[PDB]
Amino acid sequence: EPLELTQAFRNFEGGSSAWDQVGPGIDRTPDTFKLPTPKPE
Amino acid sequence: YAFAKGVKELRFLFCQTSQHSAEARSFLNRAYPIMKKHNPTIPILLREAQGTIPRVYARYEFGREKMESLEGLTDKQIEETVAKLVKT
């Protein structure tokens, strides 16, 4: 039969934070897999 | 020279832009004053929207309606185009 529900599923996903909680993190690439930097002068 | 008895409204759909030639705006610029003075009881709804192909509707009695495009017509050719609509 087509699906009817005595009580519909309540999605509380709209209660998710308006503020970002994790940020960007950190870079952990080792120097051996980064490009070189042009030294001054 | 008013309309024929039976035309219940006129409805022109044109655009502000030159995408379609300025002839409908040129005809309406001149026509709408005199074409409203001779028969004030009839609505000539001038409706425009970006990218609207020029076009005119005449609504007749008991709900019937006639449409004719105005695309490519000139300010004179558009005049007879409306003229056949309100003359009978």
Binding site: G15, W19 | L13, P33, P40, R47, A49, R55, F62, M67
Partner: protein
Amino acid sequence: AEVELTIDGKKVSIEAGSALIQACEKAGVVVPRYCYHEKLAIAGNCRMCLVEVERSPKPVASCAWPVQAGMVVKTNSPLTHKAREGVMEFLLANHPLDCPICDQGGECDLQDQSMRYGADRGRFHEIGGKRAVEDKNIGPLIKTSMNRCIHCTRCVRFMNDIAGAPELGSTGRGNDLQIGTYLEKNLDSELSGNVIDLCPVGALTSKPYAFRARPWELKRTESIDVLDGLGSNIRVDSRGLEVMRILPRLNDDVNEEWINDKTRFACDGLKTQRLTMPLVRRDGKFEPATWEQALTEIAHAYQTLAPKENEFKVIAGQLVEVESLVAMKDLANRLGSENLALDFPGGSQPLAHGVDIRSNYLFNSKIWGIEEADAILLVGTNPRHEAAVLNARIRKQWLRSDLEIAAVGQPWESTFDYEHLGTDLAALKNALSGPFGEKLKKAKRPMIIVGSGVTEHPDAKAFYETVWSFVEKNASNFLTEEWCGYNVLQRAASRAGAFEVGFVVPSPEVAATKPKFVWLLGADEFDPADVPKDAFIVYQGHHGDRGAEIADIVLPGAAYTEKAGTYVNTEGRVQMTRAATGLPGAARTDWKIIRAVSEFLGVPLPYDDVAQLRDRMAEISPALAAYDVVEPVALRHLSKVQLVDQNKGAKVTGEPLKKVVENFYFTDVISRSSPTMARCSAAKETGDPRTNFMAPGMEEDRPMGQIAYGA
């Protein structure tokens, strides 16, 4: 010019004289805030936006720091981490442990920025305890819990600057500084409920909403307010069957994050006096009918009456949408009627402005045009009771610029200053011939605003030619390449859209034909002379009110929180609602009712779906297919014909202009059925500042309280 700085290592440009916090929202850099709001003056009080800046001994308030030539800003340094952690400790030290009993929980900036920027644990344990302050009575709408206040000053800035209500303030000093009114007095501002949303915390909350919902259990629907003519953008929060609250959402072109109290607090009238079943009048009583035995009873009556041309009459109300008017215009047209009336007084005769050129009846300078306006003339309108959030925009432009306002009509208590020039057309004629006309002439961006009350007046014929003649005389000021000085202000959501498709009486020949079959399409404020006693009355709508109680048959339609209907606001913006809930009981969609009866009456309408009708809509006016935008009137100068050429010899009576809004809280069926508006009116009648005035709660004279709300 846009100067160039680097924020968090990334380069950003922004106009000089901007706040550094503003340069952060451009650079995609999140900065915590409590006191700072984009729409308010900078206060500098919270200390949550402190960031690191070079050559600066101490952290700078980013909200109050002017962007300099080449500054370098760190929003993520040990200085900023230490400041945000320490300021959170201060704001949470005397804050009450009331997160379970508070209505701001799950939607709190203080808990979301405490979780993101403060320590996980408090160090405050004093045996002396926290600060406690007493609660306050500021009217029937705003429940107070002032222990929660963090002293951000957002509501005092809003009440004093935005709303022009200088009764709220902060009395005291030190840790005992307390927001409130000194005297226990009601807040009298139609923009009052906006402090509830501005409040970072739940000290200033909604009395009608108290304890009923949590934010995570709420469905969020982006819709349009229909309770006035502005089309304010709203967010409708529903929990299943029931709408819970109405929030504003951002539209800087329309409402600017504000809604008025009637838009906000009348939603509780969407559940109270609803129509859910067809009723046929039998022996002076209303009995339930099946939809079939109601449309058949309608069809039989129409067949018996045999209405000729224009003895079928249709009157449309404030809340009707365009899918109904375009469907009703097609039904009446094929029945032989062009008699398509409007609910206001004078809505059953040809209108002073016509409907041929859209610039005749619109707010032609946009709502955004007031942002530049230098001179504004008001003709017969109270901008507070007609367009409350548009009235605020006038005040905002007035405080920050040399804007001059004068008005013609009934004097009103105003949030801005203006000159009263008179009350009638003779006064208006001197107004333009006198100093304010020269002020209107000499100004850039001049602005005449005609209210819909004028269109209701005896002399709208004469008023509308007088104004337009001034405009045409004064183009290159009024009618420039980029400006339109002519505005007509609509106070009902349905009326510009009605004008858009011709739903208007065309001629007095039509208006002089007495009807015997009258459909009231959501019409409830109809004049008693526009409805014959012996006509067969059909009422379609969603509320049992003045329209339903005089009809022979009632048909339950949808409300605006349960339909996807197009509305055109006073400036010609085309907006669509979104259904927040389903239809109650056995109600139908209104355009389907009209399409359904076209079967029974003998003339079925071609479309069977909303897209087919919206294709019909877009060839009545193609602007109705361009949503969220306002189309420019190409032939602007053609407005002379219906405004002047058609309005030349008018039997002017000299009767002064009226005040078309007697009661702001009661303007339509939804408001007249709202318990919350019933409390707003009653408190305003007697001045009771008490929060539980006709609401649950204990009082001194009410030891035991009451379950009744609104009584």
